Every structure is written in structure tokens, then in C-alpha cells.
């Protein structure tokens, strides 16, 4: 993309109804940071998501750290909290070529101030004058009245701490419902009543494919046991019934 | 398709500057590994320097190096060069040289010089 947001107002785009090939992303050489939180950057292509988020911003290259589960500062708390049992990877590279201007780049802001933190994805776009004292402003700048945004200021000679970075954060979401988002993985024919190593749209096991006698609903893609394990399943090609 | 055309022949006394440009027309532009190479009549091509646009950055060789200036104008799909204190030897024709990329595009997979200026 040519027109990333700023942090305090962050774009989201949502991913949906395709194949994910993650090779050519993680393979690329282009991305400076690429870490994972829940899942393993290199296992990443045999799993599948219900859905992903794709969220991005520029932050400042010492500010690339507090995207990240558990972190604390300014970008964390006042523009883009990540939840502590965040699934996903937070992609970051280098991009003072594209975002830096000679004289600065001014159009990437963030919040400075804020009456109390955010919560995990929360979005907060006012311009609401921030107040630090106990006098009221009545909507004007002073001192304890404060306006709560700043711009960073990219120069072609900042040191790499204060260079832009442009980051993407892939929020993989695991909820049960039908899968859109799966890796670049070849399907093979259906074995059924031989002792097989299964994988039925992220469900992994080990066992024997059998017919199902249970009516399950049209919405049903698999079943549990009492002891809530999985004991059937609905294959995703054929909307038939197995019992495994 | 694709070519790089600049602009005419200058003539220079000596201890002048000469600024010469490059003209993308065609293909997708500041991708290009811009390259600045010269030959002086009756010997072998010397290089001087390079550039790629999308990363702002210029190289320039050793004996070159505080005399040549060159920039990359992205707005207009140029590639500039600013040489200065020419003396004697310094004549000679010069050639603005590309070069296909592929890949990551920040680290080095590129192609032939494939396609070149016509002299200047």
C-alpha cells in the first residue's frame, strides 16, 4: 500500500473466503521483523482461521518493541493495545525511503495523552483537548490543557530509532465457525475404515474414518464426546457426515 | 516497449559542471537499477556510479566519489546526474544503463543491462 494510516487512526482491512499462502510472505526477504505470538512463523501454512485481520500503521523505529502482548508506553496505551492472548504475527520493516521526507514528514500522528488506557482493538479518533490539570478548558490549549496528538517528525538523517517503520499486524482469529482463511495445502482422495493421520480443516488427529449415523444440522461442522473431544467431524469438500 | 532516452551532447570547458538527465518511458519505474557508466574514446568502459530510485540512495566509485552527484526524480520518472571540476580526461560519451529487477527487491537479484541510453 502507497496511503498507511496513522497510528491513532488505524486502518483495518478484513482477509476472507481464500487461500492463504504464506510462503511468499514469510519467505520474503523484504520484512525486518517478523515475530508470532500463539502460532510459529514457519508452521503457519499447514493451519486454518476462521477469519484475518490486517491491521497497519507507521510508529517510530524505538516504538517497534511495543507492539507486542504485555508491552507499556505511549503507542501501547494511548493508539493500539494488543490483547495479552493475542494469535497472530506483527509483521515490521524499514520504510524511512517511503515514508521520510527531507525537510519531515508530518502526516503520521499519534496520541500523546489520554484519560485512561486502551482496551485490546479499541479505536479512539476525538480531538477532545486532553485535560492534566483540575481547571476546566472550555476548549482551549494551555498549560494542563493540552491537544492529545503529535506528528513524528521522519527525517532522511534521524537517527534508525526515530526512522519510520511501517507495521502490519495479522490478528489470526480461532473461533468455531466455518473456516475461509486456509494455507497453500494439497488435498488428497478420502480413506475411509483404515487407521489414518487426519487433518479435516485445522483438526488433527489420529484414528479411523468411518460413515456417520448422527443428523447433524446444516450449520454443524463437527461434534464432541461428553468429554468434549472432537468425535466427528463434516469433511469441508463433501458436506458429508464421518464419524472418527 | 521499455526504453531510457536522455538528452543531447554538451560541450564543456573545462572545470564547468554538466548535468545530464535520463528519461523511463514504459514499465514500472523506480524499480529500476539505475546505473551511470562512461568509456573514453579507444578504451575500455569505467563505471562511476548508480542508484535506485525507490530507496533515495546514490553510490558512486572511489575515483568518482565527491565529484559526482546523482539523483533520482520519481515525480517524473527521471534519473539525473550532476559531474563536476571535468578536466581533460574527463571527456568522453556517456551512457544512462537500467537494469531488470525481480524479487525481494531489497536485497541484490537483478538482470542484464538490457536496455541502454544513446550516448550523450
Known amino acids: 500500500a502507497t496511503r498507511f494510516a496513522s497510528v491513532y487512526a488505524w486502518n483495518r482491512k478484513r482477509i476472507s473466503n481464500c487461500v492463504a499462502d504464506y510462503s511468499v510472505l514469510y519467505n520474503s526477504a523484504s520484512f525486518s521483523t517478523f515475530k508470532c505470538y500463539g502460532v510459529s512463523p514457519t508452521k503457519l501454512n499447514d493451519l486454518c482461521f476462521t477469519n484475518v485481520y490486517a491491521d497497519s500503521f507507521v510508529i517510530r523505529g524505538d516504538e517497534v518493541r511495543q507492539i507486542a502482548p504485555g508491552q507499556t508506553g505511549k503507542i501501547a496505551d494511548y493508539n493500539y493495545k494488543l490483547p495479552d492472548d493475542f494469535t497472530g504475527c506483527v509483521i515490521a520493516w524499514n520504510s524511512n525511503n517511503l515514508d521520510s521526507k527531507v525537510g519531515g514528514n508530518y502526516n503520521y500522528l499519534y496520541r500523546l495523552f489520554r484519560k485512561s488506557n486502551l482496551k485490546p482493538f479499541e479505536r479512539d479518533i476525538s480531538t477532545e483537548i486532553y485535560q492534566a490539570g483540575s481547571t476546566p478548558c472550555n476548549g482551549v490549549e494551555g498549560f494542563n490543557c493540552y491537544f492529545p496528538l503529535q506528528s513524528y517528525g521522519f527525517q532522511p538523517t534521524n537517527g534508525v530509532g526515530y526512522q519510520p517503520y511501517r507495521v502490519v499486524v495479522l490478528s489470526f482469529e480461532l473461533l468455531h465457525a466455518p473456516a475461509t482463511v486456509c494455507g497453500p495445502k494439497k488435498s488428497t482422495n478420502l480413506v475411509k475404515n483404515k487407521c489414518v493421520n487426519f487433518n479435516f480443516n485445522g483438526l488433527t488427529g489420529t484414528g479411523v474414518l468411518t460413515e456417520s449415523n448422527k443428523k447433524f444440522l446444516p450449520f454443524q461442522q463437527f461434534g464432541r464426546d461428553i468429554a468434549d473431544t472432537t468425535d466427528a467431524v463434516r469433511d469441508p469438500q463433501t458436506l458429508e457426515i464421518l464419524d472418527i | 516497449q521499455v526504453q531510457l532516452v536522455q538528452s543531447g551532447a554538451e560541450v564543456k570547458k573545462p572545470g564547468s559542471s554538466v548535468k545530464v538527465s535520463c528519461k523511463a518511458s514504459?514499465?514500472?519505474?523506480?524499480?529500476?537499477?539505475i546505473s551511470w557508466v562512461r568509456q573514453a574514446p579507444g578504451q575500455g568502459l569505467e563505471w562511476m556510479g548508480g542508484?535506485?530510485?525507490?530507496?533515495?540512495?546514490?553510490n558512486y566509485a572511489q575515483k568518482f566519489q565527491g565529484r559526482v552527484t546523482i539523483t533520482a526524480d520519481e515525480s517524473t520518472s527521471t534519473a539525473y546526474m550532476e559531474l563536476s571540476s571535468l578536466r581533460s580526461e574527463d571527456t568522453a560519451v556517456y551512457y544512462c544503463?537500467?537494469?531488470?529487477?525481480?524479487?525481494?527487491?531489497?536485497?541484490?537479484?537483478?538482470?542484464?543491462?538490457?536496455?541502454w541510453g544513446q550516448g550523450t
Open positions: 544503463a537500467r537494469r531488470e529487477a525481480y524479487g525481494p527487491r531489497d536485497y541484490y537479484y537483478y538482470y542484464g543491462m538490457d536496455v
Open positions: 514504459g514499465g514500472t519505474f523506480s524499480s529500476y537499477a
Open positions: 542508484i535506485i530510485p525507490i530507496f533515495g540512495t546514490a
